[PDB]
Each structure stands twice: as C-alpha cells, then as structure tokens.
Amino acid sequence: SYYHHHHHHLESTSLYKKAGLSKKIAVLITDEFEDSEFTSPADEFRKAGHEVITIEKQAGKTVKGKKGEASVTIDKSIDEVTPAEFDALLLPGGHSPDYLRGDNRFVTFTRDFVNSGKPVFAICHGPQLLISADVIRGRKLTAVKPIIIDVKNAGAEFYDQEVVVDKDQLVTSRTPDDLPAFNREALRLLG
Amino acid sequence: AGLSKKIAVLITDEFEDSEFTSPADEFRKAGHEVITIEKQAGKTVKGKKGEASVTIDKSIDEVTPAEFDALLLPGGHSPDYLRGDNRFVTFTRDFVNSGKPVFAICHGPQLLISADVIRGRKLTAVKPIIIDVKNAGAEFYDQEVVVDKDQLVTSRTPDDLPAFNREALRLLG
Numbered sequence: 001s002y003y004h005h006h007h008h009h010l011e012s013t014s015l016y017k018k019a020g021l022s023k024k025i026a027v028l029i030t031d032e033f034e035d036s037e038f039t040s041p042a043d044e045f046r047k048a049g050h051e052v053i054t055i056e057k058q059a060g061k062t063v064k065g066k067k068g069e070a071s072v073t074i075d076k077s078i079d080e081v082t083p084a085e086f087d088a089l090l091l092p093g094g095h096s097p098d099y100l101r102g103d104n105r106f107v108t109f110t111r112d113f114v115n116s117g118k119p120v121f122a123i124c125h126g127p128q129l130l131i132s133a134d135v136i137r138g139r140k141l142t143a144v145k146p147i148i149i150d151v152k153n154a155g156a157e158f159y160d161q162e163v164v165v166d167k168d169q170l171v172t173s174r175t176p177d178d179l180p181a182f183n184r185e186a187l188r189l190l191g
Numbered sequence: 192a193g194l195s196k197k198i199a200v201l202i203t204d205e206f207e208d209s210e211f212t213s214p215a216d217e218f219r220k221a222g223h224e225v226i227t228i229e230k231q232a233g234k235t236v237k238g239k240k241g242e243a244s245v246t247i248d249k250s251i252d253e254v255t256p257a258e259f260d261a262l263l264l265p266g267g268h269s270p271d272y273l274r275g276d277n278r279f280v281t282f283t284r285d286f287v288n289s290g291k292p293v294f295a296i297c298h299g300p301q302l303l304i305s306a307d308v309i310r311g312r313k314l315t316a317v318k319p320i321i322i323d324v325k326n327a328g329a330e331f332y333d334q335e336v337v338v339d340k341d342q343l344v345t346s347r348t349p350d351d352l353p354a355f356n357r358e359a360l361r362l363l364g
Contacts, residue, residue, distance in 0.1 A: 095268060102319035132322050146275035149305050153326035 003035070003070045008042045008052035022051040023190060026086040026113070028106050028129065029072065030056050034094030035065030036176045037123050038072060041090055044183045050190060052090075055081055057103075066094040078105045083113040088190055093124025093144065101132040111135055114170075119189040123173040123182050127151055130170075140164050141172035165189075193364045196260035197224045199286070201279050201302065202245060207267035208238030209349045210296050211245060214263055217356040223363060225263075228254060228282075239267040251278045256286040261363060266297025266317065274305040284308055287343070292362040296346040296355055300324055303343075313337055314345040338362075 008027075010017045025045055029038060042052050056063060056074040064071045083089075089110070091097065100106040111133035114120055122130055127143040128150070130136050137155030142164045152158050163173045163181040168189060173182035198218055202211060215225050229236060229247040236245050256262070262283070264270065273279040284306035287293055295303055300316040301323070303309050310328025315337045325331050336354035337345050341362060346355035 095271075098268075098271075098319050101322075102317075128319075131326070132319075134322065144275075146271050146301075146305075149274075149307065150323045150326065153304070153323065153328075155326075 001069060003039055006039050006042070006070050006072055008046060008054065008072065010046065010049070010051055014049070016049050022049060023087040024051050024053055024085065025088045025090050025190070026081070026083075027052060027054045027090045027092070028056075028078070028096075028100055028109065029054050029063060029074075029092055030096050030099045031063045032066045032094050032099065033063065033092045033096035034124055034176065035067045035070040036179065037092035037094065037126070038065070038090075039070050040176075040179045041092075041121065041183055041186060044187060045190070048187055048190065050087075053081070053086070055109075078103075078109060081109075083109055083116055083118075086113070086118070088119040088121065088186070089113045090186075091120065091122040091126035091129050093126045095125070097125045097128035101129050107132045117169060119169055119171065119186070121171045121182065121186040123178070124175055127172055130154075136170075139170060140166040141170055142174050143172060144174050192222045195222045195224060196363050197226055197258065198261045198263055198363075199254070199256070199259035200225060200227045200263045200265070201229075201251075201269075201273055201282065202227050202236060202247075202265055203229050203269045203272045204236045205239045205267050205272070206236070206245075206265045206269035207297055207349060208240045208243040209352065210265035210267065210299070211238065211263075212243050213349070213352045214265075214294065214296075214356055214359060217360060218263075218363070221360055221363065226259065230276075251282060254282075256282060256289055256291070259286070259291070261292040261294065261359075262286045263359075264293065264295040264299035264302050266299045268298070270298045270301035274302050280305045290342060292342050292344065292359070294344045294355065294359040296351070297348055300345055303327075309343075312343060313339045314343055315347050316345060317347050
C-alpha cells in the first residue's frame with residue numbers, strides 16, 4: 001500500500017536525537033528498489049533508536065520504489081561518505097542493485113564495508129552488490145530465485161531459507177515475505 | 192531475399208524497447224518471421240520505456256526450440272523475470288546446445304548464464320552483469336559485438352544495435 005512521505009531519521013521527539021549518538025545504518029539505494037525492502041527494515045531500525053542514512057549519487061534526490069508505493073529522500077552522495085562512519089549496511093532489492101552495481105563507487109563501498117567485518121543486510125536482489133564486490137566466495141547466504149545461479153557462480157554456498165546469517169555478519173533473505181526473519185537477525189546484530 | 196527463418200523471442204514486460212523493435216524490424220525487412228514467447232499467448236507486454244507494445248504469439252508450454260531457426264533475447268528487466276522460471280531457462284539451454292544462432296543483448300545474456308552454457312565461450316554484455324558473465328566461466332570482451340563460433344551474437348547496449356543486427360542478419364543468411 002501507498003506509504004505517505006516515509007521518513008528514516010529519528011523523530012524530533014526522540015531522546016537520542018540531541019546527543020547524536022545513535023548507531024548508523026548506511027543504505028545504498030536508488031530508483032526501483034523493492035518498496036518494503038526499505039520501509040520495513042528502516043521502520044524497525046528507527047523504532048530501535050538507530051539512524052538510517054540513504055546513500056546514492058545526489059543528496060536531496062528523491063528515489064521511488066518499484067511499486068511506486070514509497071519514495072525516499074537521499075541523505076548523502078556516495079562521494080561524501082565512508083564505510084568507516086557507519087555501523088551497518090542495508091542493501092534493499094528490486095532493480096536498485098542492478099543500477100548501482102555498474103558504478104565502481106558503490107561496489108568499492110560494499111567491498112570495503114564487508115571487509116571491515118561490520119554487519120551487512122542484503123535481501124532479494126540486494127546480494128548482487130555483494131557479488132560485484134566479490135566478497136562472498138565460501139560464505140553462506142540466500143537470495144531471490146533469478147540470481148541463485150549468480151550467487152553460486154560467485155563461489156557462495158547457497159541455502160534456501162527465509163534468512164541466512166554468515167559469521168554473525170552477513171544477513172541475507174529471499175523476498176519481502178522473509179522480512180520478519182530478515183529484520184530479526186539484522187536487529188540482533190545491531191544490539 | 193534469402194531463406195526466411197523463424198526467430199524465437201523470449202520476452203516479457205519491461206524489456207528494453209529498442210532491443211526488441213530494432214532487431215525485429217531488421218529481421219522482418221529481411222523476410223524473417225519473428226515469434227514472441229512468454230507465459231500466455233495473446234497477452235500484451237510493454238517495454239521498459241513505455242514506447243513499444245508486444246503481443247505474445249506463443250506460450251512457452253506450446254513450443255520447442257526445434258521449430259525455430261534462431262533465438263533473440265532482448266535486455267531490460269525481461270531476462271531477470273524470465274530467468275526465474277525453469278521453462279525459459281531450459282528453452283535457452285536447449286536452444287544453445289542445438290547449435291542454432293542466438294542473439295543476446297544488454298541483459299539478455301542473463302538467460303545464457305542461467306542456462307549455464309557459456310563457460311569457455313566469448314561474449315560481451317551490459318556493464319552491471321560483467322562479473323556474473325565472468326563468474327559463469329565466459330571469456331568477456333568489451334566490444335560493440337561479439338560472435339562466438341558463428342552462433343552466439345552478443346552486444347552491450349542499444350547503441351550497439353547496428354553491429355548487433357548486422358551480425359545477427361549475417362548468421363541468418
């Protein structure tokens with residue numbers, strides 16, 4: 001369903017807002033991302049007191065979900081952020097990963113973030129960026145049907161499960177129907 | 192006019208408009224028969240840019256690679272949708288193994304990856320999937336058009352269409 005002006009930052013009523021000490025979840029996201037693959041995790045993270053930083057190519061830009069149900073404002077350009085400043089990384093699916101994996105900046109960000117050991121949450125097509133960063137050979141994960149073959153070709157050990165957690169870092173799921181489990185493990189690693 | 196040949200086309204919604212219409216136009220001008228295949232005959236699928244509309248001629252369940260002379264695989268998001276269904280993957284695998292000409296452009300090669308019939312074959316593809324084509328064992332080349340063993344014709348983007356169509360027509364003749 002349509003989600004009117006979704007917001008992903010701590011509300012002006014948050015007690016954690018002023019001190020600015022919240023954990024930060026980076027999100028590589030562009031047009032045609034799977035709507036709920038952003039709004040659901042984002043809403044859970046926000047309710048948990050974590051901040052969400054959307055990253056694309058132009059700060060202030062508005063990107064729209066594949067279903068047109070959600071539109072989100074981009075907080076930062078990938079040129080002005082570093083994997084270092086974030087605690088975790090979210091990679092929503094839809095056609096967003098396809099658009100982003102053709103840009104070395106996002107692939108490098110994903111690679112460096114993964115190599116930092118920090119938690120990464122990738123759902124549906126999201127893993128495509130992990131493939132491009134080439135950091136999943138020998139690691140356990142799942143993904144949406146059409147790319148299962150690509151994940152395997154990338155040397156990863158595929159599992160058909162609602163959620164897969166590798167070394168308490170990589171959290172992957174298959175579809176929006178796995179969101180409950182996806183969010184559970186993501187939150188767990190953030191706590 | 193040479194011997195007319197039936198060209199199968201695996202296509203669904205959100206395909207890259209010109210990646211179907213340009214080759215189709217060129218193929219028809221040469222007297223060839225273009226046959227579109229999806230899940231349900233009679234359906235109308237539209238291109239990613241809402242410019243091209245395509246009536247589906249056949250259901251993947253009612254056709255065999257044997258009845259066609261060649262296969263066209265347009266890009267866009269169509270291959271992503273199709274490669275999630277064994278029927279189209281099997282059709283692609285079987286078609287390639289038959290030795291008949293296959294023309295795949297932009298994202299089109301994704302169905303070839305899924306069919307797992309490109310290890311050791313030369314080809315090109317759109318930027319975002321280069322790593323996937325390489326992981327599949329293919330020998331990647333960044334050229335406007337790549338023809339492997341006079342069968343597999345691949346191109347990167349719509350701007351490569353002239354070369355793409357040229358080689359496809361060449362193999363059809």
